[PDB]
Amino acid sequence: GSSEQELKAIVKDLGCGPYFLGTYDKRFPGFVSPHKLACAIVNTAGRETGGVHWMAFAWNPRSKTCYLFEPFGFSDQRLKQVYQFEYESLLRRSAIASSPDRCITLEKSTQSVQGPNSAACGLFCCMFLHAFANWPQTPMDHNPTMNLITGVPNSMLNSPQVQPTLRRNQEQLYSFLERHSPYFRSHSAQIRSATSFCHLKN
Protein backbone atom coordinates (compact mmCIF):
# COMPACT_ATOMS: atom_id res chain seq x y z
CA GLY A 1 0.00 0.00 0.00
CA SER A 2 1.20 3.57 0.67
CA SER A 3 3.56 4.80 3.34
CA GLU A 4 2.88 7.91 5.43
CA GLN A 5 5.71 9.71 3.65
CA GLU A 6 4.16 9.17 0.29
CA LEU A 7 0.70 10.33 1.37
CA LYS A 8 2.28 13.40 3.14
CA ALA A 9 4.00 14.47 -0.15
CA ILE A 10 0.93 13.82 -2.26
CA VAL A 11 -1.42 15.81 0.01
CA LYS A 12 1.08 18.70 -0.02
CA ASP A 13 1.22 18.64 -3.91
CA LEU A 14 -2.58 18.67 -4.08
CA GLY A 15 -2.76 21.98 -2.19
CA CYS A 16 -4.07 20.52 1.12
CA GLY A 17 -1.03 21.78 3.04
CA PRO A 18 -2.64 24.68 4.90
CA TYR A 19 -5.39 22.37 6.37
CA PHE A 20 -3.61 19.11 6.81
CA LEU A 21 -2.76 17.97 10.26
CA GLY A 22 -0.70 14.85 9.38
CA THR A 23 -0.98 11.11 9.02
CA TYR A 24 -1.90 9.19 12.19
CA ASP A 25 -2.77 5.77 13.55
CA LYS A 26 -6.14 4.84 14.90
CA ARG A 27 -5.49 6.92 18.05
CA PHE A 28 -5.96 10.26 16.25
CA PRO A 29 -7.66 12.29 19.04
CA GLY A 30 -10.08 14.32 16.91
CA PHE A 31 -10.18 17.94 15.81
CA VAL A 32 -9.44 20.93 18.02
CA SER A 33 -10.34 23.42 15.22
CA PRO A 34 -13.27 25.64 16.06
CA HIS A 35 -12.07 28.34 13.61
CA LYS A 36 -10.29 26.59 10.72
CA LEU A 37 -10.66 23.88 8.06
CA ALA A 38 -8.71 20.79 9.08
CA CYS A 39 -8.10 17.35 7.78
CA ALA A 40 -6.08 14.24 8.46
CA ILE A 41 -5.21 10.81 7.14
CA VAL A 42 -5.91 8.09 9.79
CA ASN A 43 -4.97 4.36 9.91
CA THR A 44 -7.57 1.87 11.16
CA ALA A 45 -4.70 0.16 13.11
CA GLY A 46 -2.15 1.29 15.83
CA ARG A 47 1.36 2.18 14.74
CA GLU A 48 2.78 -0.85 16.62
CA THR A 49 1.00 -2.84 13.86
CA GLY A 50 2.93 -1.47 10.83
CA GLY A 51 -0.41 -0.09 9.66
CA VAL A 52 -3.38 -1.66 7.88
CA HIS A 53 -5.87 0.63 6.02
CA TRP A 54 -6.20 4.36 5.42
CA MET A 55 -9.13 6.71 5.86
CA ALA A 56 -9.59 10.42 5.67
CA PHE A 57 -11.25 12.63 8.22
CA ALA A 58 -12.03 16.27 7.54
CA TRP A 59 -13.49 19.13 9.49
CA ASN A 60 -15.51 22.12 8.30
CA PRO A 61 -16.22 24.62 11.15
CA ARG A 62 -18.63 26.72 9.02
CA SER A 63 -21.15 23.87 8.62
CA LYS A 64 -19.87 22.05 11.75
CA THR A 65 -19.35 18.88 9.62
CA CYS A 66 -16.94 16.11 10.31
CA TYR A 67 -16.33 14.06 7.18
CA LEU A 68 -15.30 10.42 7.22
CA PHE A 69 -14.06 9.10 3.88
CA GLU A 70 -13.22 5.41 4.02
CA PRO A 71 -12.78 3.97 0.40
CA PHE A 72 -14.82 0.77 0.85
CA GLY A 73 -17.56 2.73 2.56
CA PHE A 74 -18.06 0.19 5.33
CA SER A 75 -20.79 0.61 7.93
CA ASP A 76 -19.60 1.53 11.48
CA GLN A 77 -20.32 -2.11 12.58
CA ARG A 78 -18.24 -3.36 9.61
CA LEU A 79 -15.40 -0.99 10.32
CA LYS A 80 -15.18 -2.50 13.86
CA GLN A 81 -15.55 -6.13 12.60
CA VAL A 82 -13.16 -5.93 9.65
CA TYR A 83 -10.56 -3.49 10.95
CA GLN A 84 -11.28 -3.25 14.76
CA PHE A 85 -11.73 0.45 14.17
CA GLU A 86 -14.00 2.73 16.18
CA TYR A 87 -14.11 6.51 16.04
CA GLU A 88 -16.76 7.40 18.64
CA SER A 89 -14.23 9.20 20.86
CA LEU A 90 -12.72 11.14 17.99
CA LEU A 91 -16.21 12.43 17.09
CA ARG A 92 -17.02 13.27 20.75
CA ARG A 93 -13.75 15.16 21.23
CA SER A 94 -14.14 16.96 17.92
CA ALA A 95 -17.64 18.09 18.82
CA ILE A 96 -16.70 19.23 22.31
CA ALA A 97 -13.48 21.01 21.19
CA SER A 98 -14.77 22.56 17.96
CA SER A 99 -18.60 23.13 17.91
CA PRO A 100 -20.12 26.04 19.86
CA ASP A 101 -23.15 23.88 20.80
CA ARG A 102 -21.32 20.54 21.04
CA CYS A 103 -23.35 19.34 17.95
CA ILE A 104 -21.94 18.31 14.58
CA THR A 105 -22.99 16.53 11.44
CA LEU A 106 -21.10 13.31 10.70
CA GLU A 107 -21.15 12.83 6.95
CA LYS A 108 -19.66 9.53 5.86
CA SER A 109 -19.42 7.71 2.60
CA THR A 110 -21.73 4.67 2.25
CA GLN A 111 -20.16 3.23 -1.01
CA SER A 112 -16.98 1.75 -2.22
CA VAL A 113 -14.85 3.35 -4.83
CA GLN A 114 -12.04 0.81 -4.43
CA GLY A 115 -11.75 -2.79 -5.49
CA PRO A 116 -11.54 -5.63 -2.92
CA ASN A 117 -7.92 -6.58 -3.89
CA SER A 118 -6.68 -3.07 -4.38
CA ALA A 119 -4.04 -1.44 -2.17
CA ALA A 120 -4.98 2.14 -3.33
CA CYS A 121 -6.84 3.27 -0.10
CA GLY A 122 -4.17 5.85 0.78
CA LEU A 123 -4.42 7.38 -2.69
CA PHE A 124 -8.20 7.48 -2.80
CA CYS A 125 -7.82 9.38 0.54
CA CYS A 126 -5.57 12.07 -1.03
CA MET A 127 -8.03 12.51 -3.88
CA PHE A 128 -10.94 13.02 -1.41
CA LEU A 129 -8.83 15.53 0.51
CA HIS A 130 -8.18 17.50 -2.73
CA ALA A 131 -11.92 17.70 -3.06
CA PHE A 132 -12.36 18.81 0.54
CA ALA A 133 -9.71 21.58 0.37
CA ASN A 134 -11.38 23.08 -2.81
CA TRP A 135 -15.05 22.32 -2.13
CA PRO A 136 -15.34 21.95 1.73
CA GLN A 137 -19.10 22.14 1.59
CA THR A 138 -19.40 19.30 -0.86
CA PRO A 139 -16.28 16.96 -0.88
CA MET A 140 -18.17 13.54 -1.20
CA ASP A 141 -19.88 14.12 -4.59
CA HIS A 142 -20.92 16.81 -7.07
CA ASN A 143 -17.50 18.37 -7.39
CA PRO A 144 -14.88 18.36 -10.18
CA THR A 145 -12.65 15.88 -8.37
CA MET A 146 -15.07 13.30 -6.99
CA ASN A 147 -17.16 13.44 -10.15
CA LEU A 148 -14.26 11.49 -11.74
CA ILE A 149 -15.08 8.40 -9.75
CA THR A 150 -18.16 6.31 -9.12
CA GLY A 151 -19.40 4.81 -5.85
CA VAL A 152 -20.95 1.32 -5.89
CA PRO A 153 -23.15 0.10 -3.04
CA ASN A 154 -20.96 -1.45 -0.36
CA SER A 155 -23.04 -4.68 -0.49
CA MET A 156 -21.74 -5.20 -4.09
CA LEU A 157 -18.05 -4.84 -3.27
CA ASN A 158 -17.31 -8.43 -4.33
CA SER A 159 -19.85 -8.77 -7.11
CA PRO A 160 -18.25 -9.40 -10.47
CA GLN A 161 -20.60 -6.85 -12.15
CA VAL A 162 -19.12 -3.75 -10.39
CA GLN A 163 -15.45 -4.80 -10.86
CA PRO A 164 -14.79 -3.01 -14.13
CA THR A 165 -16.23 0.26 -12.45
CA LEU A 166 -14.04 -0.23 -9.37
CA ARG A 167 -11.08 -0.72 -11.77
CA ARG A 168 -11.99 2.32 -13.82
CA ASN A 169 -12.13 4.34 -10.51
CA GLN A 170 -8.51 3.28 -10.02
CA GLU A 171 -7.40 4.37 -13.45
CA GLN A 172 -9.14 7.74 -13.07
CA LEU A 173 -7.38 8.12 -9.69
CA TYR A 174 -3.92 7.45 -11.24
CA SER A 175 -4.76 9.88 -14.21
CA PHE A 176 -5.84 12.44 -11.61
CA LEU A 177 -2.59 12.00 -9.69
CA GLU A 178 -0.43 12.17 -12.83
CA ARG A 179 -1.76 15.55 -13.61
CA HIS A 180 -1.87 17.02 -10.04
CA SER A 181 1.13 15.63 -8.14
CA PRO A 182 4.84 16.03 -8.99
CA TYR A 183 5.64 13.34 -6.38
CA PHE A 184 3.38 10.66 -7.90
CA ARG A 185 4.74 11.59 -11.38
CA SER A 186 8.33 10.91 -10.32
CA HIS A 187 7.45 7.64 -8.49
CA SER A 188 4.65 6.56 -10.86
CA ALA A 189 5.84 3.02 -11.55
CA GLN A 190 6.63 2.18 -7.85
CA ILE A 191 3.40 3.58 -6.48
CA ARG A 192 1.28 1.94 -9.14
CA SER A 193 2.90 -1.36 -8.26
CA ALA A 194 2.58 -1.02 -4.46
CA THR A 195 -1.06 0.01 -4.79
CA SER A 196 -2.27 -1.92 -7.82
CA PHE A 197 -5.87 -3.06 -8.26
CA CYS A 198 -4.77 -6.69 -7.89
CA HIS A 199 -2.17 -6.15 -5.23
CA LEU A 200 -3.56 -8.46 -2.51
CA LYS A 201 -3.35 -11.28 -5.09
CA ASN A 202 0.38 -11.05 -5.48
Binding site: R92, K108, M140, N143, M146, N147
Partner: peptide, 11 residues
Protein backbone atom coordinates in the same frame (compact mmCIF):
# COMPACT_ATOMS: atom_id res chain seq x y z
CA UNK B 1 -18.14 10.40 -6.22
CA UNK B 2 -19.98 8.74 -3.34
CA UNK B 3 -23.33 8.64 -1.63
CA UNK B 4 -22.95 9.67 1.98
CA UNK B 5 -25.01 9.69 5.02
CA UNK B 6 -25.50 12.60 7.41
CA UNK B 7 -26.04 11.97 11.12
CA UNK B 8 -26.52 14.74 13.68
CA UNK B 9 -24.45 13.98 16.77
CA UNK B 10 -24.70 16.07 19.93
CA UNK B 11 -22.42 15.73 22.94
Amino acid sequence: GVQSLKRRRCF
